[PDB]
Amino acid sequence: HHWGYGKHNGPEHWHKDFPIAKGERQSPVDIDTHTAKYDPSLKPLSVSYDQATSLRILNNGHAFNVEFDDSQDKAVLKGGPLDGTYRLIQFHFHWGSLDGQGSEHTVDKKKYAAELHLVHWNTKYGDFGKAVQQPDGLAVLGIFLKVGSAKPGLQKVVDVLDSIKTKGKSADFTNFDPRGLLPESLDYWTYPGSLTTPPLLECVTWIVLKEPISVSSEQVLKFRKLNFNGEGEPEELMVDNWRPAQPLKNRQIKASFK
Numbered sequence: 001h002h003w004g005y006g007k008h009n010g011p012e013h014w015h016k017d018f019p020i021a022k023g024e025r026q027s028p029v030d031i032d033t034h035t036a037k038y039d040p041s042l043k044p045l046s047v048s049y050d051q052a053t054s055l056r057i058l059n060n061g062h063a064f065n066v067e068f069d070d071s072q073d074k075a076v077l078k079g080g081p082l083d084g085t086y087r088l089i090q091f092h093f094h095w096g097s098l099d100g101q102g103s104e105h106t107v108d109k110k111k112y113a114a115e116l117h118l119v120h121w122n123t124k125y126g127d128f129g130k131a132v133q134q135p136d137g138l139a140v141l142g143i144f145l146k147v148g149s150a151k152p153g154l155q156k157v158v159d160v161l162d163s164i165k166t167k168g169k170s171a172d173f174t175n176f177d178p179r180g181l182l183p184e185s186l187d188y189w190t191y192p193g194s195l196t197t198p199p200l201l202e203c204v205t206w207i208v209l210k211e212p213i214s215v216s217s218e219q220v221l222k223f224r225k226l227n228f229n230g231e232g233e234p235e236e237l238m239v240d241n242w243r244p245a246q247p248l249k250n251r252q253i254k255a256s257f258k
């Protein structure tokens with residue numbers, strides 16, 4: 001009886017195995033745009049993905065992860081609210097059963113159709129596993145998806161999903177350029193938070209871009225054909241793999257922009 005997104009194992013059950021679920025810096029949150037304070041001390045974000053080397057795409061039973069070779073200092077996030085340098089290890093999405101929900105963060109309670117997370121680990125902790133034990137171990141860049149025009153840079157991801165339909169399937173996925181998933185503007189909100197799935201570790205500096213990307217209805221419909229279940233198990237469509245907004249508690253959301 002492992003965690004998931006269903007009635008019996010979903011977000012409102014996670015605290016039993018992961019008591020930090022009710023902790024002081026849980027994610028995601030609602031971003032109240034009027035209460036978020038402009039911080040002129042925040043730097044422009046530095047997103048350096050020119051040398052990013054993707055290796056593989058994996059259906060892990062709760063999402064699909066596009067994994068990167070992080071053996072060298074290549075694809076790095078720095079600046080913005082960050083001290084030091086954070087290395088890209090994977091990206092994944094959260095999405096809905098319908099276009100009207102799917103994002104984890106919300107903006108003045110607005111839910112987007114989906115949300116992209118680019119996960120980076122702080123190089124001062126040597127690897128991904130040690131970094132998640134530290135309050136500044138990860139930086140996750142969050143990008144909202146709305147349904148409209150297709151995102152050409154997403155189609156290579158959409159087209160491989162047929163080959164990883166079920167939990168535990170992986171496929172070679174080399175030479176994928178994540179620069180094709182970024183909006184024009186790097187304006188952002190930032191706050192200290194957590195992983196949004198178990199083990200819900202409070203190790204993340206969240207950086208959430210203001211500008212959504214547009215994807216087509218057909219692109220997000222193909223996300224919704226994936227399966228939570230393994231091959232030869234009862235088919236459970238991989239939809240609504242988002243955690244709802246959690247209490248902000250003693251936190252401030254800062255804006256990079258006026």
Ligand SMILES: C[C@]12CC[C@@H]3c4ccc(OS(N)(=O)=O)cc4CC[C@H]3[C@@H]1CCC2=O
Pocket residue numbers: 117119128129132140194195196197198199201
């Ligand atoms: C803690 C973790 C690294 C981070 C992993 C992670 C990262 C992001 C994530 O999603 S999110 N939405 O917080 O970016 C989920 C998970 C669950 C498995 C987690 C892994 C389990 C063992 C390990 O080393």
Ligand SMILES: [Zn+2]
Pocket residue numbers: 092093094117196
């Ligand atoms: Zn995520």
